[PDB]
Amino acid sequence: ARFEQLALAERRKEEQQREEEFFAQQRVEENRLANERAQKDLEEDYIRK
Amino acid sequence: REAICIHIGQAGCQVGNACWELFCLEHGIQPDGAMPSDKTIGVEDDAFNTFFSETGAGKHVPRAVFLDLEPTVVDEVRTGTYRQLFHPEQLISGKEDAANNYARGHYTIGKEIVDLCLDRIRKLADNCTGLQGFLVYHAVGGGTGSGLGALLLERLSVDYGKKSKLGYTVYPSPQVSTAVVEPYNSVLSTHSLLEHTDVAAMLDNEAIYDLTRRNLDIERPTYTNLNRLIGQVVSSLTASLRFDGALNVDLTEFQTNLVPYPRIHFVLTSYAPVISAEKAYHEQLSVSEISNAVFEPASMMTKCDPRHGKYMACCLMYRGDVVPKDVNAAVATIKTKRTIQFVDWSPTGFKCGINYQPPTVVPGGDLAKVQRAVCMIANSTAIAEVFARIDHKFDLMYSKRAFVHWYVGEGMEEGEFSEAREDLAALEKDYEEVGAESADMD
Amino acid sequence: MVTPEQAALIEGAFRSMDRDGTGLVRLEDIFRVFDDSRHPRVRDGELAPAATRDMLMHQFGATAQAHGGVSFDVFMRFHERMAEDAAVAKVNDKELFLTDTIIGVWRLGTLLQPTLIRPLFPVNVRPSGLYATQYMSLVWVDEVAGPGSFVVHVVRDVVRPIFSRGDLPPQLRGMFAYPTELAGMKIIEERLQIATQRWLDFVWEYEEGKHAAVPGIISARVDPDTLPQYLRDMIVEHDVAKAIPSLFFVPTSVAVNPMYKRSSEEYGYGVPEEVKRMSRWKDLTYSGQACGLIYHGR
Amino acid sequence: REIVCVQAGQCGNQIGSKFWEVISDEHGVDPTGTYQGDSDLQLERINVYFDEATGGRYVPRSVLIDLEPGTMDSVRAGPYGQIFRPDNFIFGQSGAGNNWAKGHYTEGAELIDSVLDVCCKEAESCDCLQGFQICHSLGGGTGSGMGTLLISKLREQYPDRIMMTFSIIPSPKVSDTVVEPYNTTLSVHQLVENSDESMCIDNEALYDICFRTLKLTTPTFGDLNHLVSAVVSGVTCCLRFPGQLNSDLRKLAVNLVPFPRLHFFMMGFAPLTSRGSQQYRGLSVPELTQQMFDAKNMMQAADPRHGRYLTASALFRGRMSTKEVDEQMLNVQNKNSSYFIEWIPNNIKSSVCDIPPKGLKMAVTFIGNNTCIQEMFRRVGEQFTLMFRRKAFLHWYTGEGMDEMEFTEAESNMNDLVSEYQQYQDATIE
Amino acid sequence: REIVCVQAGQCGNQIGSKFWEVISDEHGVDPTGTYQGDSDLQLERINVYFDEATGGRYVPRSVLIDLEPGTMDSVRAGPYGQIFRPDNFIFGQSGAGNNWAKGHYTEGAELIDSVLDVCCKEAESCDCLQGFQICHSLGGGTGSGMGTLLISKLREQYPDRIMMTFSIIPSPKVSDTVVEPYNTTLSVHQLVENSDESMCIDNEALYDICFRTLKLTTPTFGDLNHLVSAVVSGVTCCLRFPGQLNSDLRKLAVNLVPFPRLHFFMMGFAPLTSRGSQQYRGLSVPELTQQMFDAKNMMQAADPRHGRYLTASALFRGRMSTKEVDEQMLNVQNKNSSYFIEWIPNNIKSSVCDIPPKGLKMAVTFIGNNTCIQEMFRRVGEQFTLMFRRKAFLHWYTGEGMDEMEFTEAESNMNDLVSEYQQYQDATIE
Ligand SMILES: Nc1nc2c(ncn2[C@@H]2O[C@H](COP(=O)(O)OP(=O)(O)OP(=O)(O)O)[C@@H](O)[C@H]2O)c(=O)[nH]1
């Protein structure tokens, strides 16, 4: 029976790995959003000039 | 045969989820209350009766109430996976919390809710024919657990009288802390709990964290691990009622054997084969190894060292494949040891129990699967050290009346602090006096 | 210098950009095709998108207004200057930087056939972690300005990512796009309509009398009057779609969202399998013929 | 358990507009008022801040008050402005003149009956009322005078509920108005009796947050109001989502205030990360605890190193271990033990909530009760006394009708508040 | 067991950039920061120098400090510069002026708190901290003054850890600056108190290595910094890979220093050989030991033949027999017996590590404690005394605020260090 216990543990390990990949993608997305904000500000200044 | 469980507040409801998860998986009732069985003969299986009653349609329902003052946790129970198991009346919720104030639970708000609770307990007790106690799970650090737990235990104690009340209690840890006002609530709780409980089992979260770090291989434990461990302990203690065995032990035998004098009812709890699945194939698990394990201070679920005191009585519960001769040989070997000492007025220090059903393995659980286990509850004078540090922290806060205006404004006389602190001081003196060897007084 | 593969890419861009057979390209094509959103400085966020137009004018107009266009040699030496400026760049690697910056700025490669949207990941690959939860947008090509002007109509957050875009026919892959893929081209926004949270079916045909569908990917809040005729023809309510004879359903998978899950959900995990096994064990013990671990009830 | 919001004056209405944008986004409410969320968890506590209109619609439990309609017309013209109920906008016909006495005595008594009528109409619709939330500046004119008037009336009418305030107080350096000391002193006098808990923010501290931590090149009031809306929406997060260790505004108040006058708190919010250094640091409990106590991230000019912590509270959002929280709070208290008041054995309360703010894996909001707050009040009192001795602008206020005795009473009361903070600040083991 | 690197001043930043290139190459870290290695042995000790940032990435545990950003902008522009965490770069707004007193008293005390805050934040993150590693030049301005200031502060805050320094010191032959003697004398005075173990390198020795051994026609500072990065990465190599006879910085210090003031060591590295010559000679333990002890290959101007070895240490990298090492060290000690101090029965410690630097079958690094190091300090002291009698440039330092008494103290302390080394040299006894 302890064999099957180990198998279920392995499945849980894979699931948490997937969650970690998700969170990394989210961090990259937020960096992109900040870059877009800076882009808009520079465009407005150029139009003024 | 049957027992009814009362869960109060946040810790008590969350521990209840783990308990009923375990009891369902151990008996085999489906999450919707069903119980599949493919054989037409051999239905005569009354063991569920301790915790469930069946309807005329054959659905099973469990003998529990859930009590909380905030809605969120019980509404989480209402929407979860076990929605269909409980009758919706059993899940009781108030409007607003006791805000970590014992005074709000006891005086203002619990007096309104308490009569509904008593009506529910009556509704349970009417569907009974041999009730032999209540099991209560709570923490004394929070407001509703302290105030409503005391009020409810007082009312239960007047109405039902002699019937036994067994408490599993989470006390504020000696240096881990979650809220500032913990000492006041714990002192005031302990004052009520002294008069109105038959056995009280003490737990500290700091000990279960240490045990889960050292023995299990969990770097970042959370409350679900502790609650699953507590559920396993309760299942071990109640297994003696539910399955066949060589030496059975009824719940009244614990109180008769463990409690020498009527105030001395606080007991320590420990569990032996806490081991991981990878470790489990490296070790044999004989009777003597697990018997030696329950006595190591690394095994305790409360942060006290029993080497700083004297044992008065021990109750040893063995479950699984054990033979009585091995239990006797183990207990005699323990008795030989020099770091284990008994008070000279207690020559026959041990009670044994032996049950054939091995502990159940829970699909998400962290304990390994093992063929045998032993669980110990013991009464020892070392606990007096636990109260003294709480008393010092209370004295430190009360010397400047640091928060008292909330409690006095919500309705309590200032005198009640001094009364409770003097009564717990007398309990400390009782534990000092009981432990003095009679050969010294001649 | 430029490697031969970069020369091939430049040749392909010039030829695909060249209308007619004449070896000249209008400056309007240069302006329309060039992609500012893939400019390195703009992507990192330290230059304004309108500054690229002035640079293009400064490099190209002097010969564009004189010879009526740009030949191949001026384009090639423009990219030679590009490489020379990228040589002193801050990036660790130089060849890949030049290659993918050329690909990004000149909009070459593989694009989804309608509305010409660049895919983020290969279309045949199932969606990964984050993109399995973020809602997608409904997009179609405008008609008052012809295709190739890169102006589209957009409705935000009306498509679930539960399906894979590789199963759709090649002429409908570009109808659904992610928010990150809309950067670099003009957008016109449309307004939703008040409705409840219902999910709606998408159907189409691949042969006369044969239909294929994907179940429940369109929100019921898409307002049908704003959409063109064909696009609202392909959207139909679920049971009506079910009643259509000889319909096939594209496989869809729903993925958990790790932003909205609780701690108490950990308790009831894997319990039906264990309880089934326990019931089998207990009935086997009751029937007899059990010699190891046996049930010890009453 | 529903909260009613009141927004007063220009600063209050501007902060409120961003707050209701942030809250509507977090619960997925479209600016038309329609629910567009993607989990039942969003819907099941929407009642806490929204009222239900017939079939779908949600309305935000807020009253907007101002003395000149310029701000209300600006918020109505904004992208979410339509959501607000039209009858909830209260305005007069002539300005406060940046004068406390006008806002309190002349236009105040004229409008005040209509605001109490609207708040009671809004309050009595709730099935059970939790505290009120008020945003205003103390340096202004209608904000200070009419805000404190309304606070006093609500404390008369609802003494058993909770009263919570967020308040902006003038920096000594970024002077936008000459008469700031009078308005601040009179408002602090009103607050120490009426309020249950008051949080104070310096605009200079928000500028230092933006420039040093976020390194923004060209900040605007939208950023400052976003920081404020972030903390405001964080304090209530445990009210409206499940968690492993629930907490509540009343439990925070009970654990933070040792004695009833000591109810002024500092605020901070931890996971602020710079625009170009996000790939370099993963979120973790050590990172949040280290950033959370860094004075760069605290929203007042006084620094904790010049005072001592009586109590602190941390509210964590996300799926995380309790062990890491308890052991971090123990380690920080033990290693820096001289900065914690010694007659309390444990000064920090923790709370844990499952649902983080959108787009962050984890966040914490920090509330601290620290004696260094006395430095702000002392500075305001010095500036007030310097002008009052010579009567620098007093004829405006006296012409409205104030007795000069009010200024000496208000000065004495503020000086006693400073003294009460000072005695606990400088105690030592003797 | 975690090491913290500090790179200070222009020399420090350049050596650090080349060192972190060599270490990142040896552990297979891409310049994007992604692990791309091909054996678990590479991964299993990455923690020693790198912290793990989210989704794969590793960041190097180093603080970069300088007073004018020109160098810092140059290192950020280099091929590996992106790997470094932006917050770890500390710079001011005006230069050291090549003046020790400015670097120590005026800009030092102004900047030092932000460096100590970063170093403490970084140190307290380790689960168990091993010693610090310090790189700086003594001839510069900010390097000498602020480096020794920071070293003194770290010795106050972490006295139980190890403090290790690599230091570049001027030359009488190829100086870049006139006021070198003051900065060198004051820095050596600070170092002899603060440091636990210090290695000294002359640029003249690196030029002779490059020109004579490698036969480069036109060497550049990149070659000198490669030689330094090779020895620096070699001393710690046994800390972070398995071996038959493990060694550690603390074990080296305990075996090399007989008495606590005698902690200045000479360095060499053996498998140096020109691309033309490499086809002519295979690697073997006799060849490495012979090259290792040849004075041509040692990185100081002083020659061992003019002094005596108190103690020495050799760290071997590669798969090799213990028999060859022990018998070689015995044979060298027995055959040249007049050059070894007689009251120690065995002066050499050996250590063996399995994993060589990439592309070499075997290598050894040598650390030697020899009294001929006294000749360098005496020479610097001579030039200082020549300059000081005439007050040649003293008004700059006195104008910063220094008392002249510091100069006489620093001269006396350096003279006593030279005397102590000379006394232990004492050729013969009686
Ligand atoms: N073992 C365990 N302990 C818990 C759990 N939740 C809270 N505690 C502990 O119990 C004490 C807090 O008590 P609570 O249950 O939160 O108090 P309450 O019953 O909710 O009372 P109110 O706050 O007034 O609603 C602290 O010592 C916590 O460490 C839990 O899930 N498991």
Ligand SMILES: Nc1nc2c(ncn2[C@@H]2O[C@H](COP(=O)(O)OP(=O)(O)O)[C@@H](O)[C@H]2O)c(=O)[nH]1
């Ligand atoms: N942080 C912040 N401060 C503001 C904002 N608007 C005004 N202030 C400040 O508040 C003070 C002016 O008070 P004001 O709100 O105009 O008073 P009122 O006229 O009574 O509404 C000045 O110190 C302004 O800098 C805002 O949107 N955000």
Ligand SMILES: Nc1nc2c(ncn2[C@@H]2O[C@H](COP(=O)(O)OP(=O)(O)O)[C@@H](O)[C@H]2O)c(=O)[nH]1
């Ligand atoms: N070996 C070596 N020496 C250097 C390097 N850079 C500068 N130096 C020497 O260090 C001295 C100049 O010190 P510098 O680093 O500029 O001091 P700083 O201005 O405080 O940083 C001169 O003797 C230079 O020859 C280098 O990369 N390698």
Ligand SMILES: [Mg+2]
């Ligand atoms: Mg509670």
